[PDB]
């Protein structure tokens, strides 16, 4: 089965809206050209798929803040991934573009949920490597965030990474200057970028020189507690960055809204 187990619809951005005809579940149908893949892995059963598939299988167990792979298919020249599609949905990059700099209460709820999702990944041995507002979807009714696009991801390891294919402006200074990083510490850097994006309405750094200068100028009013968390995540030295635990125990991170509260207060 393939083309008629899913009624397929319009382009989203090569990703199509689909409905699984066996039960009308909304889905997203992602096509990936074999030529444009550089990383491959093997599933539990041995067979050789794109890394993206391997990583999504590993995290698609149970419920979480990550968009789940429901199925996939090989074609002669492509793979096709069937993903959860929540509805109504908007990605965080568009949400921030329209709303501007988010209120701290809202930024705290989003950022916490992204931290839970990234922790979930790491627990499954998966490093995303492209955390950013464009790779985050907001389910507007439930107030739940979901991570997408594992296409630059890797298996989590504790040794150094010398390859990177994510977004440069969310990449850390050790990558810019030395083409090396460690997973968690890089992930925390990009989480600092993302947090600034939320409270200020745009990312802090556009150019390599700004990234390695680590001078964080705040363009909107932001509380001292939040500025501190952000500066901590954006420490130049990787070992000076906070662990995931220290981020979630930070004073600015306390008394988070539940997802449904977040929807009711800020999204409905």
């Amino acid at each position: 089965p393939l083309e008629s187990q899913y009624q397929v619809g319009p382009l989203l951005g090569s990703v199509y809206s689909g409905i699984r005809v066996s039960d009308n579940l909304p889905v997203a149908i992602k096509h990936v050209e074999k030529d444009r893949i550089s990383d491959w892995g093997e599933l539990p059963n041995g067979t050789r798929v794109p890394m993206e598939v391997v990583l999504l299988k590993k995290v698609s167990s149970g419920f979480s803040g990550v968009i789940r792979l429901l199925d996939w298919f090989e074609r002669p020249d492509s793979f096709v991934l069937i993903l959860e599609r929540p509805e109504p949905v908007q990605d965080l990059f568009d949400f921030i573009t329209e709303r501007g700099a988010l209120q701290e209460e809202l930024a705290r709820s989003f950022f916490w949920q992204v931290l839970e999702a990234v922790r979930h990944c790491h627990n499954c041995g998966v490093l995303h490597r492209d955390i950013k507002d464009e790779n985050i979807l907001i389910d507007l009714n439930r107030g739940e965030l979901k991570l997408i696009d594992f296409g630059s991801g890797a298996l989590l390891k504790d040794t150094v990474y010398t390859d990177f294919d994510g977004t440069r402006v969310y990449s850390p200074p050790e990558w810019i200057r030395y083409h090396r990083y460690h997973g968690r510490s890089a992930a925390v850097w990009s989480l600092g970028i993302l947090l600034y994006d939320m409270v200020c309405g745009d990312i802090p750094f556009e150019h390599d020189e700004e990234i390695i200068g680590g001078q964080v100028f705040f363009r909107q009013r932001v509380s001292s507690e939040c500025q501190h968390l952000i500066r901590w995540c954006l420490a130049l030295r990787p070992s000076d960055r906070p662990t995931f635990e220290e981020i979630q125990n930070h004073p600015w991170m306390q008394d988070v809204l539940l997802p449904q509260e977040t929807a009711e207060i800020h999204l409905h």
Binding site: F93, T97, D130, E134, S152, D165, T167, Y170, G201, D202
Partner: peptide, 7 residues
């Protein structure tokens, strides 16, 4: 000007 950033 706020913009998206490709991989």
């Amino acid at each position: 000007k706020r913009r998206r950033h490709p991989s």
